[PDB]
Design an enzyme around this catalytic site. Sequence first.
Site: not given
Ligand SMILES: Nc1ncnc2c1ncn2[C@@H]1O[C@H](COP(=O)(O)OP(=O)(O)O)[C@@H](O)[C@H]1O
Lengths: 358, 598
Positions: B33, B36, B156
Amino acid sequence: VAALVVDNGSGMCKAGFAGDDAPRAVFPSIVGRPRSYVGDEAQSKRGILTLKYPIEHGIITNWDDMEKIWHHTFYNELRVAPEEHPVLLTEAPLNPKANREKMTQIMFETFNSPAMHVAIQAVLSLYASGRTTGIVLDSGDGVSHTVPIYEGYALPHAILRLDLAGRDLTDYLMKILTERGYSFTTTAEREIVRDIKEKLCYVALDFEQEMATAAASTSLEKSYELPDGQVIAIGNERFRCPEALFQPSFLGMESCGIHETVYNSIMKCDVDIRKDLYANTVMSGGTTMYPGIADRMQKEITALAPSTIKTKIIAPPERKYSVWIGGSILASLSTFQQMWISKEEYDESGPGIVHRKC
Amino acid sequence: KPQTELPLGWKGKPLSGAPDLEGMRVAETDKESHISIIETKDKQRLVAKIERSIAEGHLFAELEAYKHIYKTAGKHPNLANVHGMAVVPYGNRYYYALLMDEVDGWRCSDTLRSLADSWKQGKINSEAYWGTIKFIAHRLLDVTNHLAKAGIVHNDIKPGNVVFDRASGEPVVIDLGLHSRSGEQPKGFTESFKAPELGVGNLGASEKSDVFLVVSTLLHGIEGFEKDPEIKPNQGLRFITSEPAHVMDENGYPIHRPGIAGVETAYTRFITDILGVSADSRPDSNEARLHEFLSDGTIDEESAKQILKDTLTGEMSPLPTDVRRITPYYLRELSDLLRTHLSSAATKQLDMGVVLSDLDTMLVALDKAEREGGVDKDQLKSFNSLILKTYSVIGAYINFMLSIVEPSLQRIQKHLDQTHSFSDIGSLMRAHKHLETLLEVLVTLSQQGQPVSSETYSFLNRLAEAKVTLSQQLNTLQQQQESAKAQLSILINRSGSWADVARQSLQRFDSTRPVVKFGTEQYTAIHRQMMAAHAAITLQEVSEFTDDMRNFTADSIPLLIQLGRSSLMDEHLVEQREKLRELTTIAERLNRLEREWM
Ligand SMILES: Nc1ncnc2c1ncn2[C@@H]1O[C@H](COP(=O)(O)OP(=O)(O)O)[C@@H](O)[C@H]1O
Ligand SMILES: Nc1ncnc2c1ncn2[C@@H]1O[C@H](COP(=O)(O)OP(=O)(O)OP(=O)(O)O)[C@@H](O)[C@H]1O
Ligand SMILES: [Ca+2]
Ligand SMILES: [Mg+2]
């Protein structure tokens, strides 16, 4: 009545009576407290304890835990009353003056010793070899020191310290064994890997030639039985581990090996005494116990020294206890009985006194 | 007015502690997903997790999970800190986005690869490494326990859903999208990491399945499963205790095989006691933290955090691009790529650019397979034939083309600078065939198409120069190999006088099963005396041959270094070379037997 001699090391504490061929007690310099025990009992009950080493790189850092080790040494190992025996302690080269006072204060005020002396560890190993002039490479669990000594006195300006010793080798061996699919990781497993190291490693006279042999064929492989009956086979790790002594880069260190550290200590001494240091290079501590190390130091130092000079290495059979044997010799001398700091002298001058007498 | 200038808003009431949105703007949107980065006027830095357009409400439920954990179990430093649901500008639209604090640092995969790498290079020691691993496992298992208090299961946990903070060195778990309540069917899962029970039957998700994920995530990072796509962490470790559990590189150094263990240890017991067992037999998060592995080798919490800060502020070890070993499956996969090019050549839809790029990677794969083991010579020759058949189809078929093929010439020219062994003979022959095929293509296209340019002309002679340097080098090494065959056969003749007597004596010594035992000198004394006596008998049986065997290995060892350990064109040479290696092992083990056992 007999004097006590205790040699406090980073890894091991050795204790006994002046006059004996060897120390009666040898145990790990480990204290363990709730998440209080010492030595092997601290290790056996590790599961309910946080283990700590009070000596780091030869130097005392936890005085609370050090006090416990001495109490253990007297009351549990030697089973004696320290109020009735005078006591010889040992110390590292370049031990801070503040540490020497704290050592003195604990013996007199905590244990009530009638008298004490403290001696430099390397200097005891040179006395043990039957010498007053020479250079000592002492290498134990936490630290290595090249100590040039002239007619009884250590030359502190030419002493070099190298934070590369047995503990680092045991740790390196744990790493390189993981390439064979062997993952030793616990402190219990760390002790097993120390056993493997002590029994399987050797110094190659020519490293690149042993590496070639180890790659060409399987004729250097050798097997070890773990305490649970499992069996592992290891190969070039045998000679690669202690090679780190000559090549600190193997440990990620940007530093000179023991052979070159030794050379440099000699070179920081006056030209006039070097010949004698070169011909009386004495080796001390458990990390100098590797088969083939004496010949390698001979080869390697002869490579750096002038071709005129005669390089003679001395490597006593039982040199993991050279420091202790030196102390047993010294305390047992009749001439020495004048040298002790007495309880009267400490009650009258306080901890500062140690620097006048030692 | 671009999207970087547009405001953000709130969808629900946000959570207590949420920032003011006034002034906040989108900075970038990263790489699933789309995530940003929201730059505040102050610059706190926030992440906005934008909803998928497929829109099944996975995102809104994720917020409600975070909410519920905060209310039931409290916040937790190793869990994401979420503020609410915002509306953010993305792709000419406003979208719903979950708003949370940025964990400024690296993902778990990148951190553990970098940690393991600094250890191997010697920047940190084994205590530091394994201490830091155990530190991470405690934190993750503390979070799985924290979620269990709320009655939430994550489902997960994997390297992508754990991110390390550079400032604190703390791991942080994220991505509750596929969460379930306890004993409800999980919303989803990742197959490589999934616990066996997770997703099948009446009983759904538990804390036990989370504990499993935490370990399969660590195992993945520790063993380096990224290097071997043919295995998956939830299958745990394979043990090989009779043979080697490792592969040897060119210079005699062992190399760890990901997923293979050579001995049981606290670490292997940890994996087996969790991954290799059912849910009811598996420990929960607090029991797992009592395990030998996690109880024993630990370092100070501040020491570990320090090591992780240092790893994260250093250089990231990059993801390895083609260190994958050449297995029959991978080599099969590469043959299927060539088979599509031949399939498209028949139908006149052959991309000339990409077939020459792919042929170059085939050459590298085949050279790699020859150095290592992995595949038998019949699977190699079939691959080699498929290459030659593909070169056959190009010649038969019929300045953009220069840029495709220059990379191939440069790689070959770099290979011409190196010091070669006999295992390079086949490598250089193939390279000559490639340069020749590149030459023919370029010259041929100028016949009926675009004439030869200055760049092409100069290229043709750079190929021609390389072809000749290749021929001379290939011809020196074939002469040297003939000297090596003769030297080999002479050495074998010498061995006749002693070989069988020595082989027998040493077989008998080996059947006694010698071995250094753990224990004191007193405890092992009988054992050591028994070996020395056996060893003394063996050296007495071969006394007359002792000088022969000593001189034999002074000659054989340097020759074995020269003949190497990899495949060679000449199969008679290889069978002979192995017979020398076996004779060399007999001689050299007897030349050292006194030193090893007496
Ligand atoms: N709070 C955060 N800080 C840094 N990176 C984040 C954070 N939240 C998400 N990400 C980054 O975004 C990526 C994908 O987000 P995630 O929530 O895992 O969505 P999905 O369910 O699509 O995998 C993660 O692997 C991570 O690197
Ligand atoms: N036979 C052997 N071969 C190799 N190493 C050994 C051998 N025996 C003991 N050692 C190592 O020597 C060290 C113990 O030596 P020693 O007791 O002289 O050091 P220490 O005095 O405790 O520490 P330090 O001298 O650093 O203060 C340990 O690291 C141990 O593994
Ligand atoms: Ca010592
Ligand atoms: Mg994710």
